[PDB]
């Protein structure tokens, strides 16, 4: 049709059936000549089948009898490799110290805060003769004069250095300081039903709390005043100082009077009743645990149920503070889960402390005959080498709204989580003790009970789950595991914030009126931690115990509707005022009209993105002529001083303006959420008219449906981060690269010849010069283009896929077209991709230098004084692919290809497109240091005089030509063996890590304009930085590449032979006088 438009020239069977059957017949008779069944290729296909139906018929009975929840939730979630140890206390302690050294003087924490203490203890708990030195310098070198804050720490840290010194040689503790907080249900006249957990006032401490825990309450009837919230700096010295006692608060216990925290005791009848004495010393340990704190040193613990924002965490936050060596578990193994479990250790984990995160589902037998193994085993077998001195299975699942007839799998699954697996759990450590003969270091158990046994309604099978746990006593005598496991049945009451009662969070304030307490999880944390106390620990190593941490909510009777009411009132008192408030407002609108009230629908401005350049700030000559010596004036030849004037970058996190964000802030602004959207082809611009209406702003690019820079983040932030940063490699950025189908090659031999073809008259002859004694070319007389059949004994080249492992890298943000930046289509169609990455990098760099017409430079400088000194490693690999691998492949490669494969090509396109610079222009290739090397020459080049200006940087790309080559060198982290470690793409790059396994290759650029100094001043440019030193180094001849060494240490060459007589050259003044 195109040719006609360009030229103008438009415009029975039964014969076969028989002709088949004989074939269909000669077919079968032949088989007899070979006895070749043509049905076996089906009987397999049928027995493979009948076995399936039954295979399945089994499989669905189960899903019918058990349930898809059970089955799909009884899966395995454990490996001996998805673990995560955590032992670097000796560093975190120095991360957290400083965080104070700044959060203070940035006025973020004042002396009247409760965490400095919550911090210091988490520091002092981690004390080291070095850590001390870490601060002495950080303190002794602080200039308090700079401001009160600079005195606020130069003062107290000196308490620490000594406080941390005393404890040095001590064991650490769990001293909580949290302000215990009470519930607060608030409703306004529009139904603003809101909950707040406010600071109680009677009890602004734990000592005060444990007392009111001791004093019971009206129905439970049958000081050391210091500077917590006043001046924590003085509380500092109060932490090591063991404030002792003789006025045991356990004597504050009236008669007939039950406290809020009592343990229990059994009678020969079969019941458990409140002892006083027994339950009177649980508390001395607490009050002790509060003025002095408990340690947990040398413990070894297991705990389960620790979802962030829960209760099995505040225990952890403790155990870590003690000196523990702990196991936590999760069924939600992910990244965010760990950085959580990482932050803990980096804030709480103390000397010797040790946590281990693991994936786990307590509904899987095979998942618990497997974990404890992974513990009661050696570090040779991959084990852990530990013994367990306690246990804490709090893990469960919600079931709410489930009454009886609605009981099915999801519960039958839970019953098994708590009960039939904790049992099998505990019946799976003894088997690991009995063998090794351990019978003096048994494991204290902490069974979370609760009295809500049918009292509430639809909790499902939460009754005979936790009620069929109080028979861990009827057995501990009957059975044989007493010398290895011991029970501390706990009874958790009404806590708040957890995902079990938070729905009920809004009546706590209502219950306390009945003379009761409701705990924060951090409060209920204090309890079971005080239940590990070395006092109890015997009390169970003699006879089991039970702890009633209920505030008395077994007395307030008929609680079910007692509670149903307390909230069923709020809804009314709240909903109505959502109804009244509106109709009255509505009423007000018919008599007055929104005509006058419309103005009260105030105008509220959404913000708008105003990107910035991040230019430095310039402070007056005072702040700077002061910060530096006054002896510097007139003392430097600036022409010989170097400086940076601009810079830019490209990567998998776009430019340098946004990466910073994900580098320091971890997440984007909108100023970086749109910029990183303008450069992925998510949005665009438009001014003019659309819908006829003039839109002038951001817009989609696939729909053109307008948008604001506010509905952007919620609209795109997700896919961006799914298509930005390290990732799973995306083929279309690499023209077909499928690391799991890596197109490859094999040189087979042929043994018989057919499937002739008929090609070209000139391919059909290139075959003969190659394949001789071979293919017969045998022209086809009619059309005139030859034919070929290869021959019985030729060679071939046959493909493959070679499922390959390394399949991740810092793919630039999917959607990056230079077009976005101002580039043509001819260049891109001509040039190596990598070179795009560079040009953009340059402009953005001049941009960053007050420079957008490079030609401007030539006003102050001579064109003969503008250098590039940049370069890459491999470079141009996208072309090399075009010469060695492609041309082989009959492909229409271009012809200038090799003026781009080089590495002087990309600093040239630049000059061939922007600069118009000046001749002999350098081009380093130091595979991975090419970007310092670039800078060393980049300076010598300058202060030599060759150039007043230069350009420096680096660039390289990623393709299957390079990675694979990096593979068999076993340098880049594999990916599979990162999956079996349960890692994730976005965490494989593990610097300074104990389990580091390799690295990942990226693709992009990064550059920097550096200049004489004096220039920039009379040039009016942003001086971002300085380059006082730059260097490169190496042992000897190109001898072995893949290993580094001392080389750079020579940047510290100096002759310490005699350092008594000082070298006056370092004293500026001396250097000034000479001048």
């Amino acid at each position: 049709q195109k040719y006609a438009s360009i030229v103008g020239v438009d415009l029975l069977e039964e014969i076969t059936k028989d002709h088949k059957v004989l074939a269909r017949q000669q077919l079968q008779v032949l088989a007899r000549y070979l006895k070749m069944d043509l049905d076996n290729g089906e009987r397999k296909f049928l027995k493979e089948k009948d076995t399936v139906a039954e295979l399945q018929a089994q499989l669905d009975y189960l899903n019918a009898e058990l349930g898809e929840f059970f089955v799909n939730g009884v899966a395995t979630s454990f490996s001996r490799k998805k673990a995560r140890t955590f032992d670097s206390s000796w560093n975190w302690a120095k991360q957290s110290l400083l965080s104070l050294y700044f959060e203070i003087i940035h006025g973020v924490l004042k002396n009247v805060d409760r965490e400095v203490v919550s911090e210091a203890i988490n520091i002092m708990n981690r004390s080291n003769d070095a850590l001390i030195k870490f601060m002495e310098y950080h303190i002794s070198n602080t200039d308090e004069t700079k401001g009160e804050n600079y005195q606020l720490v130069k003062t107290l840290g000196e308490q620490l250095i000594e406080n941390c010194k005393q404890v040095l040689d001590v064991d650490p503790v769990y001293k909580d300081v949290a302000k215990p907080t009470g519930p607060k249900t608030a409703i306004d006249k529009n139904g603003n039903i809101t909950y707040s957990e406010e600071p109680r006032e009677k009890v602004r401490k734990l000592s005060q709390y444990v007392q009111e825990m001791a004093l019971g309450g009206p129905i439970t009837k049958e000081d050391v005043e210091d500077a917590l919230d006043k001046d924590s700096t003085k509380e500092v010295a109060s932490l090591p100082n063991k404030s002792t006692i003789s006025k045991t608060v356990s004597s504050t216990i009236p008669r007939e009077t039950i406290p809020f925290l009592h343990l229990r005791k059994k009678t020969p009848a079969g019941d458990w009743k409140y002892d006083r004495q027994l339950s009177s010393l649980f508390l001395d340990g607490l009050e002790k645990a509060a003025f002095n704190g408990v340690t947990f040193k040398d413990k070894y613990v297991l705990i389960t149920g620790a979802g962030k924002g829960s209760i099995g965490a505040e225990v952890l936050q403790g155990l870590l503070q003690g000196g523990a060596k702990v196991v936590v578990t999760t069924s939600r193994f992910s990244k965010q889960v760990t950085d959580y479990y990482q932050s803990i250790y980096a804030k709480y984990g103390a000397k010797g402390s040790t946590l281990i995160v693991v994936p786990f589902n307590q509904g899987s037998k095979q998942d618990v005959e497997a974990l404890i193994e992974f513990i009661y085993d050696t570090e040779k077998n991959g084990g852990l080498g530990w013994d367990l001195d306690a246990i804490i299975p709090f893990a469960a699942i919600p079931e709410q709204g489930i009454e009886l007839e609605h009981i099915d799998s999801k519960s039958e699954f839970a019953h098994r989580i708590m009960l039939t697996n904790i049992l099998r759990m505990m019946g799976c450590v003894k088997k690991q003790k009995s063998a090794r003969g351990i019978e003096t270091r048994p494991a204290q158990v902490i069974l979370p009970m609760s009295p809500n046994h049918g009292t509430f309604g639809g909790d499902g099978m939460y009754s005979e789950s936790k009620l069929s746990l109080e028979t861990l006593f009827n057995r501990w005598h009957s059975e044989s595991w007493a010398n290895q496991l011991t029970v501390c049945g706990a009874i958790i009451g009404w806590t708040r914030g957890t995902g079990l009662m938070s729905a009920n969070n809004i009546i706590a304030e209502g219950i306390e009126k009945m003379g009761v307490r409701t705990f924060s999880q951090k409060e209920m944390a204090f309890n079971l931690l005080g239940l590990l106390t070395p006092e109890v620990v015997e009390l169970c190593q003699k006879s089991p115990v039970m702890a009633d941490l209920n505030g008395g909510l077994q007395f307030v009777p008929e609680l079910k509707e007692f509670t149903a009411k307390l909230r069923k009132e709020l809804v009314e008192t709240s909903e109505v005022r959502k109804a009244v408030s509106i109709e009255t407002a509505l009423e007000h609108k018919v008599v007055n009209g929104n005509s006058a009230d419309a103005a009260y629908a105030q105008v509220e401005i959404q913000p708008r993105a105003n990107i910035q350049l991040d230019f430095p700030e310039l402070k007056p000559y005072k702040q700077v002529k002061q910060i530096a010596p006054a002896e510097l004036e007139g003392l430097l030849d600036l022409e010989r001083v170097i400086v940076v004037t601009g810079f830019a970058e490209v990567g998998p996190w776009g430019s340098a303006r946004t990466r910073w964000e994900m580098e320091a802030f971890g997440e984007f602004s909108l100023e970086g959420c749109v910029e990183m959207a303008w450069i992925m082809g998510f949005i665009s611009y438009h001014n003019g008219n659309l819908k006829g209406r003039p839109y002038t702003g951001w817009v989609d690019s696939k729909t053109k449906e307008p948008v604001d820079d506010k509905d952007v983040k919620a609209k795109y932030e997700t896919s961006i981060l799914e298509h930005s940063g390290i990732r799973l490699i995306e083929p279309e950025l690499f023209n077909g690269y499928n690391p799991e189908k890596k197109e490859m090659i094999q040189e087979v031999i042929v043994e018989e010849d057919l499937e002739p073809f008929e090609a070209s008259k000139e391919t059909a002859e290139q075959f003969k010069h190659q394949h001789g004694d071979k293919v017969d070319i045998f022209e086809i007389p009619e059309t005139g283009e030859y034919s070929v059949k290869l021959l019985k004994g030729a060679t071939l080249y046959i493909p493959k896929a070679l499922r390959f492992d390394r399949l991740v890298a810092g793919q630039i943000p999917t959607g990056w077209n230079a077009k976005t930046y101002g580039i043509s289509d001819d260049i891109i169609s001509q040039v190596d991709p990598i070179t795009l990455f560079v040009l953009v990098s340059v402009v953005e760099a001049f941009i960053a230098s007050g420079i957008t017409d490079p030609y401007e430079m030539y006003k102050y400088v001579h064109v003969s004084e503008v250098g590039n000194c940049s370069g890459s490693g491999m470079g141009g690999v996208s072309a090399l692919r075009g010469m060695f691998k492609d041309r082989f492949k009959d492909e229409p490669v271009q012809n200038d290809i090799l003026q781009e494969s080089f590495i002087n090509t990309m600093s040239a396109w630049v000059n061939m497109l922007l600069i118009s610079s000046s001749g002999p222009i350098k081009t380093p290739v130091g595979a991975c240091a090419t970007s310092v090397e670039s800078v060393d020459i980049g300076v010598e080049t300058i202060l030599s005089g060759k150039a007043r200006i230069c350009i420096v940087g680096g660039y390289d790309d990623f393709q299957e030509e390079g990675s694979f080559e990096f593979g068999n060198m076993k340098a880049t982290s594999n990916t599979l063996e990162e999956f079996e470690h349960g890692r994730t793409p976005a965490e494989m790059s593990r610097p300074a890590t104990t389990t580091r396994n390799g690295f990942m290759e990226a693709q992009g650029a990064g550059i920097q304009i550096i200049m004489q100094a004096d220039l920039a001043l009379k040039m009016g440019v942003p001086i971002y930085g300085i380059v006082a030193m730059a260097a490169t180094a190496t042992d000897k001849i190109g001898r072995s590449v893949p290993a580094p060494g001392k080389g750079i240490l020579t940047t510290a060459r100096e002759h310490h032979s005699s350092v008594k007589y000082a070298s006056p050259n370092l004293n500026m003044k001396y250097r000034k006088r000479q001048l």
Binding site: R84, D87, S88, N91, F102, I132, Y137, I611, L613, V624, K625, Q626, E633, F647, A648, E649, G651, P652, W653, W660, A664, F665, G725, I726, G810, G850, G871, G873, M874, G926, A927, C928, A929, S931, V932, V935, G954, Y955, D956, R990, P991, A992, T993, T994, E1001, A1002, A1005, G1006, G1020, V1027, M1029, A1033, D1035, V1041, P1044, G1047, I1048, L1049, T1051, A1052
Partner: protein, 145 residues
């Protein structure tokens, strides 16, 4: 990571870095990867994002460092960001195949303008402000079209 960290110790063990003046391990690669030859910039860019900011990032993927790095008492290995009262200098160091390693460092510009006279500084000052604006303009005219 093991040998890039020893050396730092010596060159501070040898120059008299006050015990208790470690230098803070920045690892700009957990985000990006290894740009083979691009690294030194990515980390020579950060340095200046840093210098003027006052900030220090951290390896937000550092589960647990290696014990053996504890003998390097002249260094830290963060995992959480850190605003500061001010940085004054930085160090870049690259260790690539072929042994052509490398170490660049940096100073804070404001340690420069004390080398000169007031009138020349505040003269420089204005001559910049204009730039930022003219640059602001371009960046956006271009960013759009």
């Amino acid at each position: 990571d093991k040998n890039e960290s020893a050396t730092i110790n010596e060159m501070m063990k040898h120059l008299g870095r006050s015990e208790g003046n470690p230098v803070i391990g920045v690892f700009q690669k957990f985000l990006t990867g290894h740009p083979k030859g691009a690294a030194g910039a990515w980390m020579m860019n950060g340095a200046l994002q840093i210098l003027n900011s006052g900030i220090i990032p951290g390896n937000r993927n550092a589960d647990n460092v290696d014990k053996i790095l504890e003998q390097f008492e002249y260094v830290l290995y963060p995992s959480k960001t850190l605003k500061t009262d001010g940085v004054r200098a930085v160090s870049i160091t690259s260790f690539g195949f072929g042994q052509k390693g490398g170490q660049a460092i940096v100073v804070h510009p404001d340690y420069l303008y004390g080398a000169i006279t007031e009138d020349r500084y505040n003269e420089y000052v204005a001559k910049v402000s204009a730039r930022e604006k003219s640059a602001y303009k371009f960046f956006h005219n271009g960013m759009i079209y």
